[PDB]
Motif scaffolding. Sequence first.
Motif, mmCIF file in Angstrom:
data_model
loop_
_atom_site.group_PDB
_atom_site.id
_atom_site.type_symbol
_atom_site.label_atom_id
_atom_site.label_comp_id
_atom_site.label_asym_id
_atom_site.label_seq_id
_atom_site.Cartn_x
_atom_site.Cartn_y
_atom_site.Cartn_z
ATOM 1 N N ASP A 20 -6.127 -2.840 -0.180
ATOM 2 C CA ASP A 20 -7.438 -2.736 0.450
ATOM 3 C C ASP A 20 -7.383 -3.065 1.941
ATOM 4 O O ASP A 20 -8.088 -2.433 2.738
ATOM 5 N N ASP A 21 -6.546 -4.040 2.334
ATOM 6 C CA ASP A 21 -6.586 -4.654 3.662
ATOM 7 C C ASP A 21 -5.293 -4.550 4.459
ATOM 8 O O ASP A 21 -5.356 -4.478 5.687
ATOM 9 N N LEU A 26 -4.786 -1.278 7.079
ATOM 10 C CA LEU A 26 -5.980 -0.829 7.798
ATOM 11 C C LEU A 26 -5.669 -0.064 9.081
ATOM 12 O O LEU A 26 -6.244 1.004 9.320
ATOM 13 N N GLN A 81 -3.425 3.904 7.647
ATOM 14 C CA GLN A 81 -4.382 4.809 7.015
ATOM 15 C C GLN A 81 -4.371 6.172 7.685
ATOM 16 O O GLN A 81 -4.336 7.204 7.010
ATOM 17 N N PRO A 103 -7.231 2.389 0.561
ATOM 18 C CA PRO A 103 -8.318 1.476 0.945
ATOM 19 C C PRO A 103 -9.630 2.168 1.273
ATOM 20 O O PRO A 103 -10.695 1.718 0.838
ATOM 21 N N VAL A 104 -9.575 3.250 2.049
ATOM 22 C CA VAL A 104 -10.799 3.919 2.474
ATOM 23 C C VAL A 104 -11.411 4.656 1.292
ATOM 24 O O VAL A 104 -10.717 5.360 0.547
ATOM 25 N N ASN A 150 -19.218 4.902 3.310
ATOM 26 C CA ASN A 150 -18.037 4.177 3.767
ATOM 27 C C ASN A 150 -18.327 3.413 5.048
ATOM 28 O O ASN A 150 -17.872 2.275 5.214
ATOM 29 N N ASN A 177 -20.016 0.528 3.858
ATOM 30 C CA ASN A 177 -19.095 -0.446 3.292
ATOM 31 C C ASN A 177 -18.219 -1.073 4.380
ATOM 32 O O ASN A 177 -18.066 -0.537 5.480
ATOM 33 N N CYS A 228 -14.884 -1.704 4.146
ATOM 34 C CA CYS A 228 -13.569 -1.075 4.224
ATOM 35 C C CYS A 228 -13.601 0.164 5.111
ATOM 36 O O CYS A 228 -12.668 0.414 5.874
ATOM 37 N N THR A 258 -14.687 -1.735 11.428
ATOM 38 C CA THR A 258 -14.016 -2.983 11.776
ATOM 39 C C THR A 258 -13.738 -3.102 13.269
ATOM 40 O O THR A 258 -14.309 -3.971 13.937
#
Lengths: 404, 869
Positions: free
Chosen positions: A5-6, A9, A13, A51-52, A60, A63, A65, A69
């Motif tokens: 998930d992290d 990033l 991705q 993750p995305v 998204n 969200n 994720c 960020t």
Amino acid sequence: HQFGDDVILDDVQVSCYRTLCSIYSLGTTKNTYKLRPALGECLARLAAAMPVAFLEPQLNEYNACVYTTKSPRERANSVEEMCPDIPVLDRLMADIGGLAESGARYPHVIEITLPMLCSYLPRWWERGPEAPPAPPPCTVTSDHLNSLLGNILRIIVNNLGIDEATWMKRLAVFAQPIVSRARPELLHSHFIPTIGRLRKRAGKVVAEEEQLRLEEGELLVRDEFSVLCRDLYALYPLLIRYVDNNRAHWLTEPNANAEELFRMVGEIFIYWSKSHNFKREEQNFVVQNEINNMSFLQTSLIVATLKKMLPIGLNMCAPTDQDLIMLAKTRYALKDTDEEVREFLQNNLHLQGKVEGSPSLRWQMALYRGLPGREEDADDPEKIVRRVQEVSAVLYHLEQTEHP
Amino acid sequence: LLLQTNLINYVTSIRPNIFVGRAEGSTQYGKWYFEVMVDEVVPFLTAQATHLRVGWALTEGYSPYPGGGEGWGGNGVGDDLYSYGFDGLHLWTGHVARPVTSPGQHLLAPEDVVSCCLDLSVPSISFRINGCPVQGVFEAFNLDGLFFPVVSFSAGVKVRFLLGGRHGEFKFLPPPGYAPCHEAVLPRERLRLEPIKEYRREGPRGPHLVGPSRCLSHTDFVPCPVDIVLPPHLERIREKLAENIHELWALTRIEQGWTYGPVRDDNKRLHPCLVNFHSLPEPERNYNLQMSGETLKTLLALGCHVGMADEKAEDNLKKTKLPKTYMMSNGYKPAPLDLSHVRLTPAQTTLVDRLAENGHNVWARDRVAQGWSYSARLVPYRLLDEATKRSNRDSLCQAVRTLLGYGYNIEPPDQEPNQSRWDRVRIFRAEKSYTVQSGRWYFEFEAVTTGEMRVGWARPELRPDVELGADELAYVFNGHRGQRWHLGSEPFGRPWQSGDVVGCMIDLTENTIIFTLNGEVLMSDSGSETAFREIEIGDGFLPVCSLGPGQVGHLNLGQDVSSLRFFAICGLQEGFEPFAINMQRPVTTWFSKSLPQFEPVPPEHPHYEVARMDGTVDTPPCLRLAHRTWGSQNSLVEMLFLRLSLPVQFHQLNTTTYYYSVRVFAGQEPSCVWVGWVTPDYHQHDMNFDLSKVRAVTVTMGDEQGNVHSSLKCSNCYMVWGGDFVSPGQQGRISHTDLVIGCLVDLATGLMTFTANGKESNTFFQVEPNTKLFPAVFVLPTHQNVIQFELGKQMPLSAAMFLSERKNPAPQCPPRLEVQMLMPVSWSRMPNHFLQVETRRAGERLGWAVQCQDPLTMMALHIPEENRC
């Protein structure tokens, strides 16, 4: 370890999603370059580390994720501009739904694009909505998993094959967690027609060899039985895990559809019992593939289907028939016909009972009247001797093959 | 000689959960007061009597199981030596009648008040009744355990135990100092009467078996706070910490709303500490630096590591925002360090929390042990109140945030690395009559709470004092650890939550055992279904259960189909069936008692052997002990005894009184008190292993007097006459007998007090010799005074034993005399029907009323010699 998930990033991705942009050429154009199933497996592992959530890019951004960020100016510019030709999951659903009825040979995109669905939507269903575990859920429904799973079974149903297929193994093994939830309406919807299609896969097709026996013909029908045995391993390991998670409710609530499944799979086992060539064809793939057949659940899978279902089928029959089942087991020692044992048990129907003589028995069907099943209205003599006809031969073959 | 039978009623008791005790100073000044009310008579319900008594309870001697006892009939509250109570007209302590003269003599009549008072300083248990006090007390007893109130009751009583909290109006007034649970008694928990050491309770769906209860801090009320340098780096960092705690203290003050002023006021909320160190008063500065340095010393009291880090506090300076909310009356608003980027560290946070608890421990010691003030105080606790603990943890967590924000790491010395248990896991089974020699059955078990518990099947020769599956006589499964237990506990199964109805299973046709979870078959790690194949039938098997300490079970044996929770297993489709198919009754079941009950020596115990040496003219016959000289059996010191009893002559003064003394080689002065009444007492002795012959019991001294003989040639150990009610457990024994009767008169100077209750009336041989081994010890007590029949110049032990060799002067050793050794635990059988009454809400209201109506009885097999039932 659920670190996907992290821990990737920042532009990993973007770099992997560029491979998603280039994946169309692996299938759109074919000059010489075989590796597409192995490439599809390596591709399918990316959905596990996805993750995305790209079911809807707007949610998204809702969200936590990649644009949210950091500053999105530094990322430069839109999430959908990376892959304008992305397959929408609802559009993919329509694509596989239309393609399921066709079911032509590799449909080459099924080898790589189908494992996206099983590797991703099971991976994201619990994360997002329609899954009781604060921002909006980004993703899919449990009914979406049910609908596509109906199409998964339909894809295997249509793609029977005539001499060769070496793609059911990865897809059936990969689609394990989708069978875990498996909402119970699908048994009425798809599995009973599908197992009826396996009954049509039997019924003078499995018995092709015996007509020829009335050496070359055995070789030809054995080559066709290769496709049949691979199809049995396509459907069964999904069915085993589905049976484990739903045998309790079949026992507690007596399902009529389970009654039809019990007699159908018992007919498959009866064909398996006397067919030595089918056993040799079974022996071919187990030693070729070198499958332990332990983590998936002498170590046969067909007998496992029979034995795992056998509590349900025995639960259908009443305890009063048990003495007649012993008599029926003796009846099949004579190698009599199905009609012979049927009539020989039907005319001698007064042999059953023994209610008052044995109190230990009386306690037994005192429970049997307490089940949701009703009194002696549906259980006519014809259905009773039908149960005798199935289970007596089943225990005969199972008792013989038990001795290793 | 022969056995006897009689009907007998229940005797049962309950307790408030009011624990006290003489600690090393935090004893809460030893002063409480009782109060009871009764609104009934019921002198003869059906046959015998009613058994209302009230008394104290010291938590050690008590497991009053419903059934047999250490006497005649039931377990009287007072029957054991560790029991002090009163009936209404007389009292029992150690199962002895002891009436007391007082006005208004009667039993517990309706509409009466009775009470008591206790002092932990001097042992003094004094009672009182309506109108005037009773002329009798107790004194001179050990108090190395807790105490709490109790009330006894047989049946047909509807009493209420008015405590004193809010509704206990003491009609008969207390003396000063005795108060109803003032400071922290009822620690954190609502009051509720409980049965004493329960092992069966009715649930709504069914009965629930209950495991043993732990000791609720049997001693050590006084806590254990942690228990000297000043380096320069620690000096500067503790100065920084002093500044941090002071500015945070000022922050907390102004957040509360406390302005600065010279005098201390509550309405205006002034305080003179609200100045920075550059102009704070000097006593406040010294106080601040003092507990800052003590906090740092506690932080590195043990071997905690710390060293150079280049002084990162100046390197990474940050400061919290300062709006007008922090504005102070003087002007020196707090400036806390904004080190909130410290996330957490679990181990050091817990260590700082228990160090804060040590700070609270020393604070409570200063408040109570040296101050001994009154809150019109607080007990030294560790986890009493969660709110105060949370507040202290939050304050010290902000402190730890500052400490780790300085950049000073810390770890424990060795990551922070069973003295007297007395309560093994209790074991449950069916009797041998229900043994399954051959067949194939099913049952299931449920447990409300997860814990140490094992369920399965076992052979009927399960010796207790062995964990289930530790030997070949069981095939249990334990889920909490997650491994099926046998000789070598292989891994199998998994843990299971508060639920997961376990269906145990067996098949002797093909010799297979399986287990289930959540009404579903369990799978093994080794690719098989519960590999216990090829098991010899032997003498059959039967279901078995266990329970850990504090756990709860629910064993539905399948008496009917409807009671079974799941029963979704494949066995019902085939020849398998439940266990408890068709009986009129339920199965009786059996359970184990941790009563340290006597028993005989086994014939071929592997470590121990004995011998009955026949006598000659050189010496009379002798019983010789033996032991292997290694064995891995240098266990606790044994409690051995000889079989037959010896009642003292009669209760008829000089007629029948006897004396009591011990003689080793000359006249010593133990002066053990002769009792005078019939008071039967056994032979007794103890001996630790020496990897030698140890000792040898003998009967000697046939000239003119009776006398035990006790040879010993390898060590020091205890060997003198015992009692009859002896059941202290197993530990290194010293000074465990207790109690002296304080019988009194209306002037409170009654000359009837008398030391008694020689449960272990054994003189300690630690004191008598002191020499460097190779001894010839021949200790020999003498209780048989022997009236001279045919004096005539020249009374063996054997004359007094059998009552058919009194004329015989020579000694003899018939086969009935046998050495016998004390087991810690033995099997038993509970009643089929427990006392359904005594469930009137466990104390309703208006002083916790309790109701008891219906009758229920046993018969008995009271042995005359052994004095049990």
